[PDB]
């Protein structure tokens, strides 16, 4: 019900690593990583671009595991 999750902020870029800037939390179904985990994924990288408005999934960040 009421889970969070991290939702692209802006365009991340294929193969650059994650700012604060670009994550925010938001209530979004499917879940995907929780909300929680932003101070985690800190200059950890993504796979793929990822679009504005996109949940982040844990299969889209290179080396998260929860």
């Known amino acids: 019900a009421n889970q969070a999750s991290v939702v692209a902020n802006q365009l991340i870029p294929i193969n650059t690593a994650l700012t604060l800037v670009m994550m925010r939390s938001e209530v979004v179904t499917p879940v995907g990583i929780?909300?929680?985990?932003?101070?985690r994924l800190v200059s950890m990288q993504v796979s793929r671009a990822v679009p504005l408005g996109t949940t982040l999934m844990p299969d889209m960040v290179k080396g998260y595991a929860a």
Request: negative net charge; glycine residues 0%; proline residues 33%.
């Open 34 to 39: 929780p909300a929680e985990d932003i101070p």
